[PDB]
Amino acid sequence: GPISPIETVPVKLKPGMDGPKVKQWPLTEEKIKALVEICTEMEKEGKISKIGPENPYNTPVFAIKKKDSTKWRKLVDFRELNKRTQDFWPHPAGLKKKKSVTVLDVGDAYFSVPLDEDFRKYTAFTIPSINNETPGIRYQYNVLPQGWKGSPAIFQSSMTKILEPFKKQNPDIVIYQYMDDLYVGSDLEIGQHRTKIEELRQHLLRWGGYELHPDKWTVQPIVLPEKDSWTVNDIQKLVGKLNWASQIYPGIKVRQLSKLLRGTKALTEVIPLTEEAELELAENREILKEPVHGVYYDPSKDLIAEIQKQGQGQWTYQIYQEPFKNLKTGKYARMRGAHTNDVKQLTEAVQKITTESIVIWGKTPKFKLPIQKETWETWWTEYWQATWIPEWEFVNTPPL
Amino acid sequence: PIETVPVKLKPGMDGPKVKQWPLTEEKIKALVEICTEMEKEGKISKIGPENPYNTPVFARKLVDFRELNKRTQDFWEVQLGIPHPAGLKKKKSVTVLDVGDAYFSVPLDEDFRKYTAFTIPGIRYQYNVLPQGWKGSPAIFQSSMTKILEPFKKQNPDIVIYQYMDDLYVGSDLEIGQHRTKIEELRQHLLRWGLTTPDKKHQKEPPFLWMGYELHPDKWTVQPIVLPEKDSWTVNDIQKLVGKLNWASQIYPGIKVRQLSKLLRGTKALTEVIPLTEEAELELAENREILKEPVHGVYYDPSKDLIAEIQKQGQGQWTYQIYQEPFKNLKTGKYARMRGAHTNDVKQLTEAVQKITTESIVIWGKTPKFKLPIQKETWETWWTEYWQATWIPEWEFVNTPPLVKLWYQLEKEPIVGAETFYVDGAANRETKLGKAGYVTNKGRQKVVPLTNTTNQKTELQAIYLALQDSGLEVNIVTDSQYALGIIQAQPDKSESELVNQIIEQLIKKEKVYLAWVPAHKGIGGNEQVDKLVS
Ligand SMILES: O=C1Cc2ccc(-c3ccco3)cc2C(=O)N1O
Numbered sequence: 001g002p003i004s005p006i007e008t009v010p011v012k013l014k015p016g017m018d019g020p021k022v023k024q025w026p027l028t029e030e031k032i033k034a035l036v037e038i039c040t041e042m043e044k045e046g047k048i049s050k051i052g053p054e055n056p057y058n059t060p061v062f063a064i065k066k067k068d069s070t071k072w073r074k075l076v077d078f079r080e081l082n083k084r085t086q087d088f089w090p091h092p093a094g095l096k097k098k099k100s101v102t103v104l105d106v107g108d109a110y111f112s113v114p115l116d117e118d119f120r121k122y123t124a125f126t127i128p129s130i131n132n133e134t135p136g137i138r139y140q141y142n143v144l145p146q147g148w149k150g151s152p153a154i155f156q157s158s159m160t161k162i163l164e165p166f167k168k169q170n171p172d173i174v175i176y177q178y179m180d181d182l183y184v185g186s187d188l189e190i191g192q193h194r195t196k197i198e199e200l201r202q203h204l205l206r207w208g209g210y211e212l213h214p215d216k217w218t219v220q221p222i223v224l225p226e227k228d229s230w231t232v233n234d235i236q237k238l239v240g241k242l243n244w245a246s247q248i249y250p251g252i253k254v255r256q257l258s259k260l261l262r263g264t265k266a267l268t269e270v271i272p273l274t275e276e277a278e279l280e281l282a283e284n285r286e287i288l289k290e291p292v293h294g295v296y297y298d299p300s301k302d303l304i305a306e307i308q309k310q311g312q313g314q315w316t317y318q319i320y321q322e323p324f325k326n327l328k329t330g331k332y333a334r335m336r337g338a339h340t341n342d343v344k345q346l347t348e349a350v351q352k353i354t355t356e357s358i359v360i361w362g363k364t365p366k367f368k369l370p371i372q373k374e375t376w377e378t379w380w381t382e383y384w385q386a387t388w389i390p391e392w393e394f395v396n397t398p399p400l
Numbered sequence: 401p402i403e404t405v406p407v408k409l410k411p412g413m414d415g416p417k418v419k420q421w422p423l424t425e426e427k428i429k430a431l432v433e434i435c436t437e438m439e440k441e442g443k444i445s446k447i448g449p450e451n452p453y454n455t456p457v458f459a460r461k462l463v464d465f466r467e468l469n470k471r472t473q474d475f476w477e478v479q480l481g482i483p484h485p486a487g488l489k490k491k492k493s494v495t496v497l498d499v500g501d502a503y504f505s506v507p508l509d510e511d512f513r514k515y516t517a518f519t520i521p522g523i524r525y526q527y528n529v530l531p532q533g534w535k536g537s538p539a540i541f542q543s544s545m546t547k548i549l550e551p552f553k554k555q556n557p558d559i560v561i562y563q564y565m566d567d568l569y570v571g572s573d574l575e576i577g578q579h580r581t582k583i584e585e586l587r588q589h590l591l592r593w594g595l596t597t598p599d600k601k602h603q604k605e606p607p608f609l610w611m612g613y614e615l616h617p618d619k620w621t622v623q624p625i626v627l628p629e630k631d632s633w634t635v636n637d638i639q640k641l642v643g644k645l646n647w648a649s650q651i652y653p654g655i656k657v658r659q660l661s662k663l664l665r666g667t668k669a670l671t672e673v674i675p676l677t678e679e680a681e682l683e684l685a686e687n688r689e690i691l692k693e694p695v696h697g698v699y700y701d702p703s704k705d706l707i708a709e710i711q712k713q714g715q716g717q718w719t720y721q722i723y724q725e726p727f728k729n730l731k732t733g734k735y736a737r738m739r740g741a742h743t744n745d746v747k748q749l750t751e752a753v754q755k756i757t758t759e760s761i762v763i764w765g766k767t768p769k770f771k772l773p774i775q776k777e778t779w780e781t782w783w784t785e786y787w788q789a790t791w792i793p794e795w796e797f798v799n800t801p802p803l804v805k806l807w808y809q810l811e812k813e814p815i816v817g818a819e820t821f822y823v824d825g826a827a828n829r830e831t832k833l834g835k836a837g838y839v840t841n842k843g844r845q846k847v848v849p850l851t852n853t854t855n856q857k858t859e860l861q862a863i864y865l866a867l868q869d870s871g872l873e874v875n876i877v878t879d880s881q882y883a884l885g886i887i888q889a890q891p892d893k894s895e896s897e898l899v900n901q902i903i904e905q906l907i908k909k910e911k912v913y914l915a916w917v918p919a920h921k922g923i924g925g926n927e928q929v930d931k932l933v934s
């Protein structure tokens with residue numbers, strides 16, 4: 001209803017691209033009720049406005065609860081709109097180095113800067129009804145919405161003026177902003193980190209959390225088995241293991257190990273290691289510690305994260321932009337849903353890997369998930385606790 | 401009085417100018433009576449030859465807005481589907497209203513009225529209301545109908561108004577006398593906006609017909625669908641054919657519309673003769689026995705839980721029932737999907753649980769509790785060992801045979817004292833000649849000739865031979881991840897008859913351990929059988 005007193009920034013889509021036209025998926029009753037109570041108050045506050053069917057665009061919507069959060073937070077799956085939105089106009093490499101980093105939800109601050117009146121039709125979203133009893137309620141945004149990649153870019157001007165009274169009285173506090181969040185890290189005591197993150201929190205209120213510790217994040221390297229009694233099966237499993245690493249490290253040699261298995265032998269027969277193969281093994285064990293050749297971060301290319309299900313509640317992952325040159329590899333275990341829910345553990349691991357990628361490189365990866373599309377597209381919104389959403393492809397070919 | 405919806409043509413495109421078909425004194429007079437009526441009711445206005453555009457008119461009256469629809473912008477259809485009567489809760493007082501001349505009572509964008517121009521075969525007409533047959537009339541009406549209804553629903557919170565197209569469902573737990581006056585207000589409220597509601601399209605006593613359902617006090621039954629057995633279809637009653645049959649598809653699954661629709665790959669006139677391609681004659685007939693089967697269900701009680709029970713049937717078909725009290729089903733259906741590559745029953749059951757879950761969220765906004773014909777231990781073994789992430793919601797076992805089982809299980813470690821078969825396959829040039837064989841640590845070996853095969857098929861054939869010529873326990877080693885991955889997918893059915901009998905051998909086995917090694921390395925077992933298929 002009311003126009004914004006402060007002035008609008010002109011935004012456009014990518015060249016030759018139209019706005020998103022994504023169908024709304026069915027919502028549970030609790031979410032529709034939550035989306036109804038939220039969008040009415042948002043409409044009264046002039047933040048959104050009811051539109052008709054003349055607007056051919058639409059974006060999905062649902063609601064989440066954060067970890068230990070009891071209240072519903074609206075989440076709009078802007079993944080298509082962001083893909084078609086222009087790029088705007090640095091990432092602090094020190095965020096990874098701090099002892100404690102807290103994440104704050106600053107998405108509500110975006111509800112004070114108006115959306116370009118000619119860009120608002122691309123933020124259309126519809127709230128579905130139970131059993132289609134009534135036609136869904138259509139809306140579009142009049143202000144910067146949460147989850148749109150252009151909102152923090154347009155708010156960078158305002159956000160800077162709010163934080164610099166804080167950031168030069170604390171010139172060693174790393175403050176990174178990605179989408180609706182502020183990533184804020186320090187090497188301070190745990191007691192003195194929490195009240196300095198609360199003071200920055202209440203300085204935000206003067207205008208108008210969730211904690212991480214990134215200096216102990218691990219990297220799981222390639223590890224060959226070292227048993228003491230090698231069987232035929234134990235050796236030919238290490239040979240394809242090492243022949244696999246030859247795509248990463250071209251200096252691997254598997255021949256003198258394979259020489260030990262020459263002749264049609266039974267898999268359970270124990271094979272003594274003729275010592276010219278252990279030299280090949282010790283060399284292969286130590287031609288696995290060096291940095292991979294040609295591995296670096298290109299911020300102009302997409303990130304990719306593959307997740308493998310190891311079973312017993314543990315999941316391995318590798319972050320890379322081009323294969324065999326991994327930027328990071330790791331393994332999770334004992335997450336929510338362990339030993340009872342694969343979807344909930346995969347959804348957690350996607351959230352953990354993305355949080356890492358935002359801290360390290362400032363970008364979320366494109367995930368290859370080990371699950372059928374239909375199973376994931378049935379449950380993932382029931383366990384999502386993040387204000388961002390990444391893009392994903394589905395893996396139906398078994399590994400190793 | 402209703403605010404108009406701004407309609408734009410697609411960018412860079414002008415209005416339609418399709419020439420009128422000239423016709424006979426017989427129905428060219430009815431048109432101007434029909435049209436004067438419409439002009440006397442305000443629905444059409446007159447302009448001369450100033451605007452250029454044209455829309456053909458045939459002959460009750462009919463207008464062909466196809467060319468105009470191809471030039472009209474896209475409208476976001478807000479509806480995610482039709483309502484299901486099982487989604488209704490029992491209300492003490494129910495009423496079904498229908499709006500008279502739903503389309504002919506919502507004003508059209510005045511800037512867009514020029515492209516609507518048509519000519520009686522002379523005076524030219526341009527519409528000022530939503531025309532029947534136009535692309536935007538359904539979306540604009542329902543949107544117009546909604547916000548016209550909103551101040552009434554807000555000031556009458558004690559009633560619920562469900563709206564879809566012409567039919568208004570008005571339910572309430574009020575007294576019949578109080579429910580009586582609340583309706584007349586709604587009709588008077590609608591009448592003030594130019595939307596009358598006739599008195600015998602008004603449904604007063606029950607069986608209440610809402611969207612082809614008879615809403616009895618404690619049950620609902622679908623309206624018997626009956627569509628013609630005429631002899632010479634024209635593409636209007638072929639388009640009304642595809643229309644009112646692919647709404648029947650929601651309540652009646654398996655009613656497909658591909659054949660008929662395909663009959664309009666042409667510039668056909670709407671009144672000319674249309675020949676049924678013999679493909680289209682089974683389309684209708686295939687489900688004319690499906691359409692005649694009845695459907696009935698109970699209403700929804702939100703105080704009780706939703707129970708979904710699934711049963712196994714023939715040829716990858718599955719039946720399910722959704723109820724709250726035992727055997728008082730709200731909805732039942734059939735599901736039928738076998739994979740195009742390799743499927744097993746546990747996968748199909750997981751798919752069935754997911755498909756019912758979604759339509760349960762569509763109808764009631766919640767996931768039912770499932771009763772499935774599978775052991776907890778059978779499921780526990782499957783999902784914990786499956787290479788992919790999988791899971792099903794909170795469920796319990798129901799002992800309704802045929803129960804779903806795991807027909808075999810590959811071992812995790814090689815078997816001591818079991819014969820070790822190394823297998824491989826190969827093909828040669830244009831030779832159309834294949835070799836699949838094995839070699840064994842005990843010296844056993846075999847090689848057979850093959851006729852028309854891929855390279856995977858040879859590797860799959862090699863594995864199958866090792867399963868044939870071996871005891872109850874066996875270790876097999878292949879260089880083919882394709883073959884090893886297919887068995888890793890754990891199928892119990894296949895369309896490949898070779899794969900089907902690899903399954904049959906696998907079932908009869910007691911312990912199988914499949915092993916992979918990279919081809920063309922120094923591995924002793926692989927290279928020997930590889931040379932044999934050189
Ligand atoms: O002799 C050979 C050589 C060979 C080369 C490549 C591949 C291959 C490529 C991608 C997947 O598999 C497979 C084979 C193979 O199965 N045999 O037996």
Ligand SMILES: [Mn+2]
Nearest residue numbers: 824825879919
């Ligand atoms: Mn091979």
Ligand SMILES: [Mn+2]
Nearest residue numbers: 824825919930
């Ligand atoms: Mn070979």
